[PDB]
């Protein structure tokens, strides 16, 4: 029977995690499966309108339609990204709610431990039920002391319940990222001690953490990379053309720039890094943990965990996947920084060419010629996203990848939920 309860608890914990991640991932899936919004469609519409234009580069109506489609493309990028941003905010709130529930359960369990210790059937049951509900949120190991009192210990060793004593966790901004809520344990003297997420990868809390870092962040970076690569390559080409009044074409799109967060554990909080894109086709869909080891800068890509020592250019700027990172002065050993090259790409994206006449369809100044227009339409068949995918290939793959990860989690979660029901039955009888 003891073994039975344990196995059941283990399975509920696993199930809570899978189910949470499946649920959150299904939101990303549904957002992307909708063809009535697909960036593939907004992109095709943009390119179709562009092909229409390439045929009669002089037609102001066709020029104006292109602008309309450029606006819709950017608006579709922004709509999708903002939904992902709203989901991130919900994850952060859910983390806080999880911590509050955990704290609550822990105090309840400690008080029950106390009541029980004084009598020493229903209190034993009430405690067991509370323990199982807590273990659904975050994994805890039960141990019992003489007198029959329960200890509840987390994977990192934090004693959430020590007989009559309950301890608490706290939802706090992560040290690496001020916009990110994470979890800490509470030391009486030192305050909040952050727990690395890898140690909270159990239960619904672990499902939220895993979804955010492995699914949500990556979706946002892949979408961001696409918008960036598209914006920069279209702009680069547009500016080599000449508009209807014979003037040099200008940047057609605005795009958000890289952002870098200085770890709050750093020696001097005023030390910052900045990053700028210098080759959009080498920009990756990842963030970067960059650590100054006293001599060199060690970089770890969040997307694939690959690492490397950064080389510096003549100016002493770090050279990272199509970016240059300015470090300045003040860096101490073990100082850490989180570079996000594309996460704000979309929120600051906009159409700069408002005037139908300002579209640069010509290769030569009129001072008809649709050569540059054809160069822009050819971008559709070019591998400018990460150096190896076209715009269409990059979105399609994201859609596909999310869809597949979703279906798989659906299977795992249904299976695990069934395991829970089967074990519970075998327990009741």
PDB file of N, CA and C in Angstrom, residues 276-376:
ATOM      1  N   UNK A 276      24.259  45.003 -31.909  1.00  0.00           N
ATOM      2  CA  UNK A 276      23.678  45.552 -33.120  1.00  0.00           C
ATOM      3  C   UNK A 276      23.798  44.511 -34.205  1.00  0.00           C
ATOM      4  N   UNK A 277      22.802  44.439 -35.077  1.00  0.00           N
ATOM      5  CA  UNK A 277      22.823  43.467 -36.129  1.00  0.00           C
ATOM      6  C   UNK A 277      23.656  44.004 -37.295  1.00  0.00           C
ATOM      7  N   UNK A 278      24.601  43.194 -37.790  1.00  0.00           N
ATOM      8  CA  UNK A 278      25.436  43.580 -38.930  1.00  0.00           C
ATOM      9  C   UNK A 278      25.249  42.640 -40.105  1.00  0.00           C
ATOM     10  N   UNK A 279      24.634  41.481 -39.891  1.00  0.00           N
ATOM     11  CA  UNK A 279      24.367  40.562 -40.996  1.00  0.00           C
ATOM     12  C   UNK A 279      23.163  39.734 -40.583  1.00  0.00           C
ATOM     13  N   UNK A 280      21.994  40.226 -40.972  1.00  0.00           N
ATOM     14  CA  UNK A 280      20.732  39.636 -40.624  1.00  0.00           C
ATOM     15  C   UNK A 280      20.617  38.172 -41.035  1.00  0.00           C
ATOM     16  N   UNK A 281      21.321  37.740 -42.079  1.00  0.00           N
ATOM     17  CA  UNK A 281      21.199  36.357 -42.511  1.00  0.00           C
ATOM     18  C   UNK A 281      21.965  35.419 -41.610  1.00  0.00           C
ATOM     19  N   UNK A 282      22.705  35.940 -40.653  1.00  0.00           N
ATOM     20  CA  UNK A 282      23.399  35.038 -39.740  1.00  0.00           C
ATOM     21  C   UNK A 282      22.788  35.103 -38.337  1.00  0.00           C
ATOM     22  N   UNK A 283      21.785  35.959 -38.162  1.00  0.00           N
ATOM     23  CA  UNK A 283      21.101  36.090 -36.879  1.00  0.00           C
ATOM     24  C   UNK A 283      20.339  34.783 -36.595  1.00  0.00           C
ATOM     25  N   UNK A 284      20.502  34.258 -35.385  1.00  0.00           N
ATOM     26  CA  UNK A 284      19.864  32.994 -34.999  1.00  0.00           C
ATOM     27  C   UNK A 284      18.633  33.164 -34.101  1.00  0.00           C
ATOM     28  N   UNK A 285      17.796  32.140 -34.047  1.00  0.00           N
ATOM     29  CA  UNK A 285      16.626  32.176 -33.217  1.00  0.00           C
ATOM     30  C   UNK A 285      17.006  31.608 -31.843  1.00  0.00           C
ATOM     31  N   UNK A 286      17.705  32.398 -31.064  1.00  0.00           N
ATOM     32  CA  UNK A 286      18.166  31.986 -29.760  1.00  0.00           C
ATOM     33  C   UNK A 286      18.478  33.196 -28.927  1.00  0.00           C
ATOM     34  N   UNK A 287      18.521  33.027 -27.603  1.00  0.00           N
ATOM     35  CA  UNK A 287      19.125  34.057 -26.785  1.00  0.00           C
ATOM     36  C   UNK A 287      20.560  33.601 -26.486  1.00  0.00           C
ATOM     37  N   UNK A 288      21.317  34.443 -25.792  1.00  0.00           N
ATOM     38  CA  UNK A 288      22.720  34.132 -25.455  1.00  0.00           C
ATOM     39  C   UNK A 288      23.035  34.466 -24.001  1.00  0.00           C
ATOM     40  N   UNK A 289      23.572  33.483 -23.298  1.00  0.00           N
ATOM     41  CA  UNK A 289      24.164  33.746 -22.003  1.00  0.00           C
ATOM     42  C   UNK A 289      25.668  33.970 -22.276  1.00  0.00           C
ATOM     43  N   UNK A 290      26.142  35.169 -21.936  1.00  0.00           N
ATOM     44  CA  UNK A 290      27.526  35.580 -22.213  1.00  0.00           C
ATOM     45  C   UNK A 290      28.194  35.829 -20.865  1.00  0.00           C
ATOM     46  N   UNK A 291      29.291  35.143 -20.600  1.00  0.00           N
ATOM     47  CA  UNK A 291      29.961  35.327 -19.307  1.00  0.00           C
ATOM     48  C   UNK A 291      31.412  35.772 -19.519  1.00  0.00           C
ATOM     49  N   UNK A 292      31.844  36.801 -18.817  1.00  0.00           N
ATOM     50  CA  UNK A 292      33.225  37.230 -18.918  1.00  0.00           C
ATOM     51  C   UNK A 292      33.988  36.435 -17.884  1.00  0.00           C
ATOM     52  N   UNK A 293      34.908  35.579 -18.325  1.00  0.00           N
ATOM     53  CA  UNK A 293      35.671  34.726 -17.402  1.00  0.00           C
ATOM     54  C   UNK A 293      36.945  35.381 -16.883  1.00  0.00           C
ATOM     55  N   UNK A 294      37.029  36.703 -16.977  1.00  0.00           N
ATOM     56  CA  UNK A 294      38.217  37.426 -16.544  1.00  0.00           C
ATOM     57  C   UNK A 294      39.139  37.799 -17.700  1.00  0.00           C
ATOM     58  N   UNK A 295      39.138  36.973 -18.745  1.00  0.00           N
ATOM     59  CA  UNK A 295      39.971  37.212 -19.906  1.00  0.00           C
ATOM     60  C   UNK A 295      39.134  37.222 -21.159  1.00  0.00           C
ATOM     61  N   UNK A 296      38.368  36.150 -21.310  1.00  0.00           N
ATOM     62  CA  UNK A 296      37.559  35.996 -22.489  1.00  0.00           C
ATOM     63  C   UNK A 296      36.060  35.982 -22.164  1.00  0.00           C
ATOM     64  N   UNK A 297      35.271  36.032 -23.223  1.00  0.00           N
ATOM     65  CA  UNK A 297      33.831  36.061 -23.095  1.00  0.00           C
ATOM     66  C   UNK A 297      33.319  34.723 -23.584  1.00  0.00           C
ATOM     67  N   UNK A 298      32.651  34.016 -22.684  1.00  0.00           N
ATOM     68  CA  UNK A 298      32.075  32.725 -23.043  1.00  0.00           C
ATOM     69  C   UNK A 298      30.566  32.866 -23.247  1.00  0.00           C
ATOM     70  N   UNK A 299      30.137  32.379 -24.402  1.00  0.00           N
ATOM     71  CA  UNK A 299      28.790  32.478 -24.917  1.00  0.00           C
ATOM     72  C   UNK A 299      28.173  31.085 -25.036  1.00  0.00           C
ATOM     73  N   UNK A 300      26.926  31.002 -24.540  1.00  0.00           N
ATOM     74  CA  UNK A 300      26.118  29.789 -24.609  1.00  0.00           C
ATOM     75  C   UNK A 300      24.794  30.126 -25.310  1.00  0.00           C
ATOM     76  N   UNK A 301      24.446  29.439 -26.389  1.00  0.00           N
ATOM     77  CA  UNK A 301      23.166  29.686 -27.035  1.00  0.00           C
ATOM     78  C   UNK A 301      22.043  28.956 -26.274  1.00  0.00           C
ATOM     79  N   UNK A 302      21.023  29.690 -25.858  1.00  0.00           N
ATOM     80  CA  UNK A 302      19.906  29.055 -25.158  1.00  0.00           C
ATOM     81  C   UNK A 302      19.151  28.037 -26.014  1.00  0.00           C
ATOM     82  N   UNK A 303      19.112  28.216 -27.333  1.00  0.00           N
ATOM     83  CA  UNK A 303      18.312  27.317 -28.168  1.00  0.00           C
ATOM     84  C   UNK A 303      18.828  25.875 -28.272  1.00  0.00           C
ATOM     85  N   UNK A 304      20.154  25.696 -28.363  1.00  0.00           N
ATOM     86  CA  UNK A 304      20.745  24.380 -28.579  1.00  0.00           C
ATOM     87  C   UNK A 304      21.842  24.042 -27.597  1.00  0.00           C
ATOM     88  N   UNK A 305      22.077  24.937 -26.663  1.00  0.00           N
ATOM     89  CA  UNK A 305      23.061  24.738 -25.604  1.00  0.00           C
ATOM     90  C   UNK A 305      24.514  24.747 -26.111  1.00  0.00           C
ATOM     91  N   UNK A 306      24.719  25.080 -27.381  1.00  0.00           N
ATOM     92  CA  UNK A 306      26.084  25.141 -27.880  1.00  0.00           C
ATOM     93  C   UNK A 306      26.820  26.312 -27.257  1.00  0.00           C
ATOM     94  N   UNK A 307      28.137  26.171 -27.087  1.00  0.00           N
ATOM     95  CA  UNK A 307      28.925  27.267 -26.508  1.00  0.00           C
ATOM     96  C   UNK A 307      30.206  27.523 -27.306  1.00  0.00           C
ATOM     97  N   UNK A 308      30.799  28.684 -27.070  1.00  0.00           N
ATOM     98  CA  UNK A 308      32.032  29.039 -27.763  1.00  0.00           C
ATOM     99  C   UNK A 308      32.562  30.322 -27.157  1.00  0.00           C
ATOM    100  N   UNK A 309      33.866  30.498 -27.267  1.00  0.00           N
ATOM    101  CA  UNK A 309      34.557  31.705 -26.860  1.00  0.00           C
ATOM    102  C   UNK A 309      34.393  32.719 -27.983  1.00  0.00           C
ATOM    103  N   UNK A 310      33.902  33.896 -27.651  1.00  0.00           N
ATOM    104  CA  UNK A 310      33.677  34.895 -28.661  1.00  0.00           C
ATOM    105  C   UNK A 310      35.009  35.449 -29.178  1.00  0.00           C
ATOM    106  N   UNK A 311      35.086  35.645 -30.487  1.00  0.00           N
ATOM    107  CA  UNK A 311      36.193  36.383 -31.083  1.00  0.00           C
ATOM    108  C   UNK A 311      35.742  37.847 -31.082  1.00  0.00           C
ATOM    109  N   UNK A 312      36.722  38.758 -31.072  1.00  0.00           N
ATOM    110  CA  UNK A 312      36.474  40.201 -31.021  1.00  0.00           C
ATOM    111  C   UNK A 312      36.988  40.828 -32.300  1.00  0.00           C
ATOM    112  N   UNK A 313      36.313  41.867 -32.770  1.00  0.00           N
ATOM    113  CA  UNK A 313      36.779  42.497 -33.990  1.00  0.00           C
ATOM    114  C   UNK A 313      37.834  43.527 -33.622  1.00  0.00           C
ATOM    115  N   UNK A 314      38.342  44.253 -34.621  1.00  0.00           N
ATOM    116  CA  UNK A 314      39.378  45.271 -34.395  1.00  0.00           C
ATOM    117  C   UNK A 314      39.002  46.248 -33.300  1.00  0.00           C
ATOM    118  N   UNK A 315      37.698  46.480 -33.169  1.00  0.00           N
ATOM    119  CA  UNK A 315      37.204  47.466 -32.232  1.00  0.00           C
ATOM    120  C   UNK A 315      36.948  46.851 -30.868  1.00  0.00           C
ATOM    121  N   UNK A 316      37.274  45.576 -30.732  1.00  0.00           N
ATOM    122  CA  UNK A 316      37.008  44.907 -29.470  1.00  0.00           C
ATOM    123  C   UNK A 316      35.538  44.525 -29.263  1.00  0.00           C
ATOM    124  N   UNK A 317      34.767  44.453 -30.342  1.00  0.00           N
ATOM    125  CA  UNK A 317      33.375  44.040 -30.198  1.00  0.00           C
ATOM    126  C   UNK A 317      33.284  42.535 -30.367  1.00  0.00           C
ATOM    127  N   UNK A 318      32.473  41.880 -29.545  1.00  0.00           N
ATOM    128  CA  UNK A 318      32.262  40.449 -29.687  1.00  0.00           C
ATOM    129  C   UNK A 318      31.530  40.189 -31.020  1.00  0.00           C
ATOM    130  N   UNK A 319      31.949  39.160 -31.737  1.00  0.00           N
ATOM    131  CA  UNK A 319      31.320  38.792 -32.980  1.00  0.00           C
ATOM    132  C   UNK A 319      30.452  37.545 -32.756  1.00  0.00           C
ATOM    133  N   UNK A 320      29.134  37.708 -32.767  1.00  0.00           N
ATOM    134  CA  UNK A 320      28.221  36.590 -32.477  1.00  0.00           C
ATOM    135  C   UNK A 320      27.096  36.479 -33.503  1.00  0.00           C
ATOM    136  N   UNK A 321      27.080  35.393 -34.272  1.00  0.00           N
ATOM    137  CA  UNK A 321      25.971  35.152 -35.168  1.00  0.00           C
ATOM    138  C   UNK A 321      25.375  36.443 -35.738  1.00  0.00           C
ATOM    139  N   UNK A 322      26.124  37.123 -36.614  1.00  0.00           N
ATOM    140  CA  UNK A 322      25.627  38.305 -37.329  1.00  0.00           C
ATOM    141  C   UNK A 322      25.461  39.563 -36.500  1.00  0.00           C
ATOM    142  N   UNK A 323      25.924  39.536 -35.263  1.00  0.00           N
ATOM    143  CA  UNK A 323      25.808  40.693 -34.403  1.00  0.00           C
ATOM    144  C   UNK A 323      27.185  41.165 -33.944  1.00  0.00           C
ATOM    145  N   UNK A 324      27.287  42.414 -33.539  1.00  0.00           N
ATOM    146  CA  UNK A 324      28.490  42.897 -32.873  1.00  0.00           C
ATOM    147  C   UNK A 324      28.053  43.339 -31.525  1.00  0.00           C
ATOM    148  N   UNK A 325      28.745  42.905 -30.491  1.00  0.00           N
ATOM    149  CA  UNK A 325      28.370  43.268 -29.155  1.00  0.00           C
ATOM    150  C   UNK A 325      29.400  44.175 -28.515  1.00  0.00           C
ATOM    151  N   UNK A 326      28.988  45.386 -28.165  1.00  0.00           N
ATOM    152  CA  UNK A 326      29.881  46.322 -27.498  1.00  0.00           C
ATOM    153  C   UNK A 326      29.879  46.050 -26.019  1.00  0.00           C
ATOM    154  N   UNK A 327      31.064  45.795 -25.456  1.00  0.00           N
ATOM    155  CA  UNK A 327      31.186  45.519 -24.021  1.00  0.00           C
ATOM    156  C   UNK A 327      31.622  46.714 -23.176  1.00  0.00           C
ATOM    157  N   UNK A 328      32.377  47.615 -23.781  1.00  0.00           N
ATOM    158  CA  UNK A 328      32.864  48.775 -23.062  1.00  0.00           C
ATOM    159  C   UNK A 328      33.901  48.424 -22.013  1.00  0.00           C
ATOM    160  N   UNK A 329      33.736  48.978 -20.822  1.00  0.00           N
ATOM    161  CA  UNK A 329      34.696  48.743 -19.759  1.00  0.00           C
ATOM    162  C   UNK A 329      33.925  48.559 -18.460  1.00  0.00           C
ATOM    163  N   UNK A 330      34.553  47.878 -17.511  1.00  0.00           N
ATOM    164  CA  UNK A 330      33.945  47.651 -16.212  1.00  0.00           C
ATOM    165  C   UNK A 330      33.689  46.187 -15.901  1.00  0.00           C
ATOM    166  N   UNK A 331      33.797  45.338 -16.919  1.00  0.00           N
ATOM    167  CA  UNK A 331      33.530  43.910 -16.774  1.00  0.00           C
ATOM    168  C   UNK A 331      34.457  43.210 -15.797  1.00  0.00           C
ATOM    169  N   UNK A 332      33.863  42.512 -14.836  1.00  0.00           N
ATOM    170  CA  UNK A 332      34.624  41.731 -13.859  1.00  0.00           C
ATOM    171  C   UNK A 332      34.401  40.250 -14.140  1.00  0.00           C
ATOM    172  N   UNK A 333      35.287  39.403 -13.627  1.00  0.00           N
ATOM    173  CA  UNK A 333      35.162  37.966 -13.833  1.00  0.00           C
ATOM    174  C   UNK A 333      33.822  37.457 -13.299  1.00  0.00           C
ATOM    175  N   UNK A 334      33.234  36.515 -14.029  1.00  0.00           N
ATOM    176  CA  UNK A 334      31.941  35.903 -13.692  1.00  0.00           C
ATOM    177  C   UNK A 334      30.714  36.790 -13.937  1.00  0.00           C
ATOM    178  N   UNK A 335      30.928  37.980 -14.502  1.00  0.00           N
ATOM    179  CA  UNK A 335      29.825  38.870 -14.873  1.00  0.00           C
ATOM    180  C   UNK A 335      29.042  38.207 -15.994  1.00  0.00           C
ATOM    181  N   UNK A 336      27.716  38.271 -15.912  1.00  0.00           N
ATOM    182  CA  UNK A 336      26.885  37.526 -16.863  1.00  0.00           C
ATOM    183  C   UNK A 336      25.884  38.465 -17.530  1.00  0.00           C
ATOM    184  N   UNK A 337      25.520  38.197 -18.781  1.00  0.00           N
ATOM    185  CA  UNK A 337      24.629  39.090 -19.525  1.00  0.00           C
ATOM    186  C   UNK A 337      23.737  38.225 -20.403  1.00  0.00           C
ATOM    187  N   UNK A 338      22.503  38.632 -20.622  1.00  0.00           N
ATOM    188  CA  UNK A 338      21.584  37.837 -21.409  1.00  0.00           C
ATOM    189  C   UNK A 338      21.235  38.660 -22.611  1.00  0.00           C
ATOM    190  N   UNK A 339      21.673  38.203 -23.764  1.00  0.00           N
ATOM    191  CA  UNK A 339      21.474  38.914 -25.019  1.00  0.00           C
ATOM    192  C   UNK A 339      20.301  38.300 -25.760  1.00  0.00           C
ATOM    193  N   UNK A 340      19.343  39.125 -26.163  1.00  0.00           N
ATOM    194  CA  UNK A 340      18.167  38.646 -26.912  1.00  0.00           C
ATOM    195  C   UNK A 340      18.142  39.414 -28.219  1.00  0.00           C
ATOM    196  N   UNK A 341      18.618  38.801 -29.292  1.00  0.00           N
ATOM    197  CA  UNK A 341      18.782  39.540 -30.546  1.00  0.00           C
ATOM    198  C   UNK A 341      17.500  39.747 -31.324  1.00  0.00           C
ATOM    199  N   UNK A 342      16.455  38.960 -31.077  1.00  0.00           N
ATOM    200  CA  UNK A 342      15.253  39.101 -31.895  1.00  0.00           C
ATOM    201  C   UNK A 342      13.927  39.188 -31.139  1.00  0.00           C
ATOM    202  N   UNK A 343      13.962  39.071 -29.818  1.00  0.00           N
ATOM    203  CA  UNK A 343      12.718  39.012 -29.074  1.00  0.00           C
ATOM    204  C   UNK A 343      11.872  40.303 -29.209  1.00  0.00           C
ATOM    205  N   UNK A 344      12.509  41.450 -29.444  1.00  0.00           N
ATOM    206  CA  UNK A 344      11.781  42.724 -29.690  1.00  0.00           C
ATOM    207  C   UNK A 344      11.725  43.105 -31.176  1.00  0.00           C
ATOM    208  N   UNK A 345      12.194  42.227 -32.034  1.00  0.00           N
ATOM    209  CA  UNK A 345      12.163  42.547 -33.431  1.00  0.00           C
ATOM    210  C   UNK A 345      10.770  43.021 -33.863  1.00  0.00           C
ATOM    211  N   UNK A 346       9.765  42.252 -33.479  1.00  0.00           N
ATOM    212  CA  UNK A 346       8.412  42.490 -33.968  1.00  0.00           C
ATOM    213  C   UNK A 346       7.669  43.642 -33.349  1.00  0.00           C
ATOM    214  N   UNK A 347       7.804  43.834 -32.047  1.00  0.00           N
ATOM    215  CA  UNK A 347       6.986  44.863 -31.421  1.00  0.00           C
ATOM    216  C   UNK A 347       7.307  46.251 -31.979  1.00  0.00           C
ATOM    217  N   UNK A 348       8.514  46.404 -32.529  1.00  0.00           N
ATOM    218  CA  UNK A 348       8.940  47.693 -33.099  1.00  0.00           C
ATOM    219  C   UNK A 348       9.016  47.706 -34.615  1.00  0.00           C
ATOM    220  N   UNK A 349       8.393  46.714 -35.233  1.00  0.00           N
ATOM    221  CA  UNK A 349       8.365  46.619 -36.680  1.00  0.00           C
ATOM    222  C   UNK A 349       7.283  47.568 -37.186  1.00  0.00           C
ATOM    223  N   UNK A 350       7.525  48.210 -38.321  1.00  0.00           N
ATOM    224  CA  UNK A 350       6.537  49.117 -38.952  1.00  0.00           C
ATOM    225  C   UNK A 350       6.894  49.356 -40.416  1.00  0.00           C
ATOM    226  N   UNK A 351       5.912  49.799 -41.190  1.00  0.00           N
ATOM    227  CA  UNK A 351       6.128  50.150 -42.587  1.00  0.00           C
ATOM    228  C   UNK A 351       6.519  51.610 -42.679  1.00  0.00           C
ATOM    229  N   UNK A 352       7.732  51.855 -43.159  1.00  0.00           N
ATOM    230  CA  UNK A 352       8.235  53.220 -43.290  1.00  0.00           C
ATOM    231  C   UNK A 352       7.861  53.879 -44.630  1.00  0.00           C
ATOM    232  N   UNK A 353       7.640  53.067 -45.633  1.00  0.00           N
ATOM    233  CA  UNK A 353       7.272  53.620 -46.925  1.00  0.00           C
ATOM    234  C   UNK A 353       5.774  53.755 -46.943  1.00  0.00           C
ATOM    235  N   UNK A 354       5.317  54.990 -46.758  1.00  0.00           N
ATOM    236  CA  UNK A 354       3.914  55.326 -46.738  1.00  0.00           C
ATOM    237  C   UNK A 354       3.436  55.757 -48.129  1.00  0.00           C
ATOM    238  N   UNK A 355       4.336  56.373 -48.895  1.00  0.00           N
ATOM    239  CA  UNK A 355       3.994  56.945 -50.190  1.00  0.00           C
ATOM    240  C   UNK A 355       4.157  55.975 -51.379  1.00  0.00           C
ATOM    241  N   UNK A 356       3.042  55.689 -52.054  1.00  0.00           N
ATOM    242  CA  UNK A 356       3.036  54.730 -53.158  1.00  0.00           C
ATOM    243  C   UNK A 356       4.130  55.012 -54.160  1.00  0.00           C
ATOM    244  N   UNK A 357       4.451  56.285 -54.316  1.00  0.00           N
ATOM    245  CA  UNK A 357       5.493  56.704 -55.243  1.00  0.00           C
ATOM    246  C   UNK A 357       6.890  56.385 -54.755  1.00  0.00           C
ATOM    247  N   UNK A 358       7.042  56.201 -53.443  1.00  0.00           N
ATOM    248  CA  UNK A 358       8.359  55.909 -52.904  1.00  0.00           C
ATOM    249  C   UNK A 358       8.832  54.440 -53.022  1.00  0.00           C
ATOM    250  N   UNK A 359       8.020  53.569 -53.603  1.00  0.00           N
ATOM    251  CA  UNK A 359       8.486  52.199 -53.809  1.00  0.00           C
ATOM    252  C   UNK A 359       9.565  52.147 -54.918  1.00  0.00           C
ATOM    253  N   UNK A 360      10.724  51.593 -54.584  1.00  0.00           N
ATOM    254  CA  UNK A 360      11.852  51.520 -55.487  1.00  0.00           C
ATOM    255  C   UNK A 360      11.833  50.291 -56.406  1.00  0.00           C
ATOM    256  N   UNK A 361      11.068  50.377 -57.483  1.00  0.00           N
ATOM    257  CA  UNK A 361      10.970  49.265 -58.418  1.00  0.00           C
ATOM    258  C   UNK A 361      12.114  49.222 -59.459  1.00  0.00           C
ATOM    259  N   UNK A 362      12.744  50.361 -59.701  1.00  0.00           N
ATOM    260  CA  UNK A 362      13.751  50.492 -60.762  1.00  0.00           C
ATOM    261  C   UNK A 362      15.197  50.346 -60.284  1.00  0.00           C
ATOM    262  N   UNK A 363      16.074  49.827 -61.146  1.00  0.00           N
ATOM    263  CA  UNK A 363      17.501  49.696 -60.814  1.00  0.00           C
ATOM    264  C   UNK A 363      18.258  50.958 -61.136  1.00  0.00           C
ATOM    265  N   UNK A 364      17.688  51.770 -62.027  1.00  0.00           N
ATOM    266  CA  UNK A 364      18.305  53.014 -62.450  1.00  0.00           C
ATOM    267  C   UNK A 364      17.379  54.180 -62.194  1.00  0.00           C
ATOM    268  N   UNK A 365      17.949  55.336 -61.908  1.00  0.00           N
ATOM    269  CA  UNK A 365      17.124  56.507 -61.680  1.00  0.00           C
ATOM    270  C   UNK A 365      16.478  56.986 -62.975  1.00  0.00           C
ATOM    271  N   UNK A 366      15.143  56.999 -62.981  1.00  0.00           N
ATOM    272  CA  UNK A 366      14.338  57.528 -64.077  1.00  0.00           C
ATOM    273  C   UNK A 366      14.881  58.881 -64.519  1.00  0.00           C
ATOM    274  N   UNK A 367      15.627  59.516 -63.616  1.00  0.00           N
ATOM    275  CA  UNK A 367      16.255  60.804 -63.869  1.00  0.00           C
ATOM    276  C   UNK A 367      17.358  60.712 -64.913  1.00  0.00           C
ATOM    277  N   UNK A 368       7.936  50.618 -65.649  1.00  0.00           N
ATOM    278  CA  UNK A 368       9.010  50.731 -66.675  1.00  0.00           C
ATOM    279  C   UNK A 368      10.213  49.905 -66.256  1.00  0.00           C
ATOM    280  N   UNK A 369      11.147  50.536 -65.560  1.00  0.00           N
ATOM    281  CA  UNK A 369      12.276  49.796 -65.037  1.00  0.00           C
ATOM    282  C   UNK A 369      11.742  49.100 -63.782  1.00  0.00           C
ATOM    283  N   UNK A 370      11.589  47.783 -63.861  1.00  0.00           N
ATOM    284  CA  UNK A 370      11.096  46.991 -62.747  1.00  0.00           C
ATOM    285  C   UNK A 370      12.141  46.000 -62.196  1.00  0.00           C
ATOM    286  N   UNK A 371      13.397  46.174 -62.618  1.00  0.00           N
ATOM    287  CA  UNK A 371      14.529  45.321 -62.246  1.00  0.00           C
ATOM    288  C   UNK A 371      14.732  45.149 -60.733  1.00  0.00           C
ATOM    289  N   UNK A 372      14.735  46.247 -59.988  1.00  0.00           N
ATOM    290  CA  UNK A 372      14.863  46.112 -58.543  1.00  0.00           C
ATOM    291  C   UNK A 372      13.649  45.390 -57.945  1.00  0.00           C
ATOM    292  N   UNK A 373      12.476  45.640 -58.516  1.00  0.00           N
ATOM    293  CA  UNK A 373      11.288  44.947 -58.074  1.00  0.00           C
ATOM    294  C   UNK A 373      11.471  43.452 -58.223  1.00  0.00           C
ATOM    295  N   UNK A 374      12.094  43.014 -59.320  1.00  0.00           N
ATOM    296  CA  UNK A 374      12.294  41.583 -59.550  1.00  0.00           C
ATOM    297  C   UNK A 374      13.341  41.074 -58.542  1.00  0.00           C
ATOM    298  N   UNK A 375      14.344  41.887 -58.254  1.00  0.00           N
ATOM    299  CA  UNK A 375      15.321  41.536 -57.235  1.00  0.00           C
ATOM    300  C   UNK A 375      14.648  41.329 -55.845  1.00  0.00           C
ATOM    301  N   UNK A 376      13.568  42.064 -55.581  1.00  0.00           N
ATOM    302  CA  UNK A 376      12.867  41.992 -54.289  1.00  0.00           C
ATOM    303  C   UNK A 376      11.978  40.777 -54.242  1.00  0.00           C
TER     304      UNK A 376
END
